[PDB]
Subunit: 233 residues, 6 copies
Amino acid sequence: EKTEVVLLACGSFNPITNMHLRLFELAKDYMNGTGRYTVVKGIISPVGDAYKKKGLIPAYHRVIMAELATKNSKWVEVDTWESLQKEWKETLKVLRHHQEKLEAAVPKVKLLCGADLLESFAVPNLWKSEDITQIVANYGLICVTRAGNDAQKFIYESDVLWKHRSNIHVVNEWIANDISSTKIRRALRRGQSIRYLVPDLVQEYIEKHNLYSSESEDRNAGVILAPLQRNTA
Amino acid sequence: EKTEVVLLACGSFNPITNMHLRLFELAKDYMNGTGRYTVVKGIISPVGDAYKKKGLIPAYHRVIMAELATKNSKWVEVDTWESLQKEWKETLKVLRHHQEKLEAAVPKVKLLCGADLLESFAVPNLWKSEDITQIVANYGLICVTRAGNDAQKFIYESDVLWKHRSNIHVVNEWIANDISSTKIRRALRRGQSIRYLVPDLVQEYIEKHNLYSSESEDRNAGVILAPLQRNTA
Amino acid sequence: EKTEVVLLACGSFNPITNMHLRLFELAKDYMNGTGRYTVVKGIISPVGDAYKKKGLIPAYHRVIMAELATKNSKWVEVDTWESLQKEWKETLKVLRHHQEKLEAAVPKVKLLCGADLLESFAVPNLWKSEDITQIVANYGLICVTRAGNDAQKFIYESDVLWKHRSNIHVVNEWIANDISSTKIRRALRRGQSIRYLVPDLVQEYIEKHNLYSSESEDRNAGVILAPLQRNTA
Amino acid sequence: EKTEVVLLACGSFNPITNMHLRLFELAKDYMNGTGRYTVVKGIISPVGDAYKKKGLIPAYHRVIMAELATKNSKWVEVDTWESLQKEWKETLKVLRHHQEKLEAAVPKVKLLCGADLLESFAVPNLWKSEDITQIVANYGLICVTRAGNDAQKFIYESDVLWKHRSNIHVVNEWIANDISSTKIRRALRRGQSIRYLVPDLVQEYIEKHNLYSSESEDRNAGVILAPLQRNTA
Amino acid sequence: EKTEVVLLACGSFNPITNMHLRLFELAKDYMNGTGRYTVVKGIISPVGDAYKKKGLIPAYHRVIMAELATKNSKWVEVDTWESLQKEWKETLKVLRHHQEKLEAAVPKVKLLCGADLLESFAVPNLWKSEDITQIVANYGLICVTRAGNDAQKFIYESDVLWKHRSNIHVVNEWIANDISSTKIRRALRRGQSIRYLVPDLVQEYIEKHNLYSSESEDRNAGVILAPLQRNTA
Amino acid sequence: EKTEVVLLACGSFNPITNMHLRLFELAKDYMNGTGRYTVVKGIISPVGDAYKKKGLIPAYHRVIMAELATKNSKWVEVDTWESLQKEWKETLKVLRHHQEKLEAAVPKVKLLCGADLLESFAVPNLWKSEDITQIVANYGLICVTRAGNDAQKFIYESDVLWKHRSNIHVVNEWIANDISSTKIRRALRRGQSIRYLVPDLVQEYIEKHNLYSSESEDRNAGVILAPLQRNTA
Ligand SMILES: Nc1ncnc2c1ncn2[C@@H]1O[C@H](COP(=O)(O)OP(=O)(O)OC[C@H]2O[C@@H]([n+]3cccc(C(=O)O)c3)[C@H](O)[C@@H]2O)[C@@H](O)[C@H]1O
Ligand SMILES: Nc1ncnc2c1ncn2[C@@H]1O[C@H](COP(=O)(O)OP(=O)(O)OC[C@H]2O[C@@H]([n+]3cccc(C(=O)O)c3)[C@H](O)[C@@H]2O)[C@@H](O)[C@H]1O
Ligand SMILES: Nc1ncnc2c1ncn2[C@@H]1O[C@H](COP(=O)(O)OP(=O)(O)OC[C@H]2O[C@@H]([n+]3cccc(C(=O)O)c3)[C@H](O)[C@@H]2O)[C@@H](O)[C@H]1O
Ligand SMILES: Nc1ncnc2c1ncn2[C@@H]1O[C@H](COP(=O)(O)OP(=O)(O)OC[C@H]2O[C@@H]([n+]3cccc(C(=O)O)c3)[C@H](O)[C@@H]2O)[C@@H](O)[C@H]1O
Ligand SMILES: Nc1ncnc2c1ncn2[C@@H]1O[C@H](COP(=O)(O)OP(=O)(O)OC[C@H]2O[C@@H]([n+]3cccc(C(=O)O)c3)[C@H](O)[C@@H]2O)[C@@H](O)[C@H]1O
Ligand SMILES: Nc1ncnc2c1ncn2[C@@H]1O[C@H](COP(=O)(O)OP(=O)(O)OC[C@H]2O[C@@H]([n+]3cccc(C(=O)O)c3)[C@H](O)[C@@H]2O)[C@@H](O)[C@H]1O
């Protein structure tokens, strides 16, 4: 009857916050609420250090925090495949990977993201055109966000996205919360409480290892983001 | 040297959410960050049932939820005095109570709140004008908010507030947080996840007792908020 | 397999403009486009003069303009049944009348409207709270609007609406062109051209009979709208 | 008494939409309602294919759609001279061509356009500074727009425009329109109805010959706009 | 040839500020700028204390302040007629008075105001509908404002104003300054400097006679504004 | 107890306006109004011509106008040290010059400016980072503005500014004035009145020397601002 689905969220999780977790809760309620789907699992897949994003701290720290964060979740877990590859991995391959790992009525892996990432699809030389087509046509996208109209319009404004709109779901986040990783690192650098913005275990981990600082924010300064170096060379 | 202050946050807490706890964190960082204050304790004071606010479930439960939410707080505690009054009590009075209670240099009690409360000072018949005066003049008011300029403007537009502006500290909430009790109860009636929006013990306590629903939202329908009744009769 | 559906649009249509016609095109495309419905007919049902809406000219003229406006329409037609009733007719009863009429698998009658009409569900005493429930539950509502987030937010704020959410389809109008009747009447009072804002036949008809004036605009001036009368008597 | 004006609108009309026709009716009512002018003719002049604008279909088709759109216009007509020109023509040369054509009291030829075109005067290398001056100074510019306080701000910021302000008439479009050619093409590529957004004959012509597609949309892709080509070499 | 005009500004001038003076410079530059008018004089006409506007100090101080403000003006002067009547005087009358006094080619008197006043034409019972008609029909209105589009729209929305639009001139205040009398009194009450907001002499007359206070702001507290009493009795 | 401060405002004052003078009234009111500062002097320090800002007329005239503008001020004066420097001086140096001067308790010198200058800190290569740091840390900055949430946010978005937030006082301008020099020059070139936007003497001096024109606006056309030239060579 209903189609089973696995929500896969690729990201930097630098560091993970209640917001990324909350992203899962919302997508699940929505998907299960349509009556035509059953969300069987949530997978958080931290990006490997080969991504080179500014300030991106070492993967093990990010993976451990994301594990610490899901420890009390009953349906959301961390998968380390992508973080372990040596070369940065294109989200479409990370999707094809878990979709195949499942084939061994098979659950459909769908990409879970906020409007943020959905919109980078338009940044020049960031995403391969064929990648986007396959991602929305063969897996599906589930976009959670406050600016529901922005996202809806962004879709309307792209022929590929519009064509596969049946396979793309914008999920409104009426409870306006935005605990951005950037604001968190900022708060940390400035010695301010992030208590209640991230899970206590993550907060404790960050504290013990004294993660995030001016030094850390500088990692990868002046280094082009992996996806771009690829489409420029 | 520094003025020790106690942050008293009066409200319904129907139910307490991460946002209300976040409020104490912000205010603490801000007050200590000024260098001229030392925040020694936070006090969550739920409103007795005589308030009659629409949807207000029993005080005892709201008190229990606040204690649950603060089990793991080293400086924020709950105070039941207000919840025990047969007669709804005016915030000015609650403040006098705590200030007088503290005397037994003595820390100063300041009312912690959002811009929602500050602005309601202008709702007709809601607050006693002479009360607004002694609150800001004699105690103080720490107002946390996402719209700092509207709060600023609101203060500038009132001779009483402006005059005593040195006792009104507008605190900026750069991390967009809007976890309103109203949206929580709304999610609850619909069976949606409210995990990571409220502390877990609070979510668990609520799930267990089915505290929020259509029927509870109707409590006090047609009844006049206590303060308004008292200033019209 | 696919649900045959009929779009019924109740409204004053005083006068009908390219915009009301556009409503039918946008909705049909959407429904047909979701793959689960097949729009077979469009019905324009001008409200009866008993509505007593400020500026409402005689129904017969409004009916005829709707006829001219759809004279070339392959699928949209004009039904005079509601206008011919002596008493003002609630939309629920008109929906029933037309659904019952079709039953003589039968096609499902759905209410076609704009954000305007949807949000008026919240005007005190305007709609019976049960008529609303039966409309969204037993019939369905297709709401066309430029401000989609507002319409959706309106659904999210209403338990009843949110509850029958799967029967309420918000359709985005990306080609934002609000040719309101109010601006058409004003333009005619000032002798402006309204050509290309309404179908030529309607334009020509209006000029020939000199329909809109300061006079017609004063019709029902001071009379309380029919739905509000009923709900006060 | 009055000055007899002829409104010349140069543009691509790819394809012409109700809003373009609406442009003429708006301007005629405004110029005539000042009491000091008399609009005697409206001329639509489709740009030639040599303009190399992305997505621009053959002038043959744009001319014929412009003609069907105006077949029932008592005062607006189409002039094929600009399009039939092997070379792309500067608007100044087209204005001139038409003025001179008339002198063979002579009606003043004025440029009819939207805030769009007017604001493009600031696009580096798009318009020759002297051609701008000569258009506003020797011909006149009637700019229809929804954003009157932009067209106005733009004139107030250009010493040149401001100096000839008396010859630049900003006409307000109160019926918030937006039927852009881009959005019509997008809809046609998506097989969506455009009925009631353009004249029936144009709709029928476009449908019958499947004029707009992904293919047509790609015409000239990578080709620099004729004006930019000229002012850079 | 050119029409001579006298700009009459009816207002409370409580107190007058650089902005009121500014109003005249702006209007004069505009009227003269059109090339078809010649501004030969400006007239500031303080409202009589019979207006009963809350906080309105005595006419004599307002008149002396306005004369002091215009001491150095070569073309703007104060007329005391209005302020000298025992009965509050309808602006249409104040206009008729000055126009008749000029006939003693003959300069046309036109009312000079901000958007504030133009728009108050809508407030229920504030202006006798026939007065508005005569003012825009038989004299003319020059409205200076930062919100040129609002005034423009407000006119568009009024059949009366729109019909005589050729006699109404909206003049754009590009160098936005908004020294409202209200903010001046507020600043004064608070002991804040008003230097450089009003003319030095005015600023010095207020300092000398301690004109604005809490006390004064209360004048006419609870007294219905004169025009309102008249149109409700 | 209270700290004596001197407000130093570095800028072009090309030409000085009411607004620049306004800046000192506001800031003196704010600082003394905090109860912990005593503002003893205001200093207008016009920039030397070595600055090379486009359109900057000769130092001498700017200095004279500043003196005419402040002739009658009890506490605000003009210091020509910057105007007399052959090489453009970095604001830090000016601040250092005055501070040292005073030391011959000693008043603290603080930079007075608008949000405009503050935000210019992010213009690439405009200000030397070590300078920004030294200015906010060792001297102080009082920023006046109508968009103080933009200044508040700009401070919050920079670690250095945030780190020194205690030394940066954002002062709200509730009376909305944006009488910029650029708009004044635009008005003068167009022959419009600027009476009441600048003090009378200043306006009289500009009119007598015909200081601002198309020609003057061209000074330094094509030359890089001193600061930018320095940090790029
Ligand atoms: N407030 C908010 N509300 C709702 N969702 C929010 C959010 N803030 C972040 N999010 C979402 O959180 C998730 C993770 O956030 P964050 O830690 O910031 O993750 P971020 O660094 O933005 O992750 C970018 C991801 O895209 C992948 N990518 C980028 C570029 C090209 C290609 C390619 O295959 O060509 C792939 C990349 O490998 C990485 O997995 C995202 O889905 C983001 O949109
Ligand atoms: N998004 C947000 N960001 C920051 N702060 C936010 C917030 N949403 C709520 N808050 C704050 O959270 C706190 C608790 O909220 P909530 O639980 O909804 O509490 P609420 O019902 O708004 O609390 C009303 C309180 O005001 C008192 N009151 C009302 C009227 C007259 C008088 C009187 O003495 O005359 C006193 C009343 O006794 C009670 O203690 C408030 O201070 C609120 O402003
Ligand atoms: N720009 C725009 N974009 C998209 N849609 C737009 C629109 N402007 C109007 N519309 C829609 O066009 C349609 C016709 O509009 P208009 O001519 O103005 O018609 P209008 O007067 O708004 O029609 C109101 C209708 O609601 C019915 N009603 C009202 C209140 C209570 C009850 C009851 O049963 O209790 C029933 C009433 O009998 C009538 O049929 C509406 O659905 C309107 O919202
Ligand atoms: N919503 C709206 N409301 C009101 N008016 C609107 C409008 N959308 C477009 N318009 C107006 O409709 C008209 C037709 O638009 P569209 O079909 O898109 O025509 P478009 O491609 O924008 O036309 C450009 C025209 O400018 C000429 N041009 C461009 C650049 C440099 C020079 C030169 O001599 O140096 C000349 C060019 O030859 C062509 O005739 C325009 O005047 C446009 O602004
Ligand atoms: N920021 C700004 N930009 C441009 N103009 C601005 C302005 N602030 C005020 N102004 C203008 O300044 C002028 C004087 O300001 P202010 O002192 O505040 O004038 P205010 O008290 O608003 O003056 C009301 C005037 O209207 C008359 N009135 C009222 C109601 C009904 C009738 C009737 O005949 O039925 C007549 C009344 O007798 C009095 O002369 C006004 O024209 C105002 O709009
Ligand atoms: N509306 C408004 N409200 C409040 N204040 C306003 C204002 N408009 C301007 N102001 C303020 O007025 C003052 C003077 O205005 P204006 O004449 O336009 O001054 P402007 O030319 O913008 O002043 C530049 C100043 O910055 C210094 N600077 C620039 C770049 C790098 C460095 C360095 O050390 O590296 C120093 C420069 O030497 C000069 O003193 C400024 O503080 C400006 O922000």
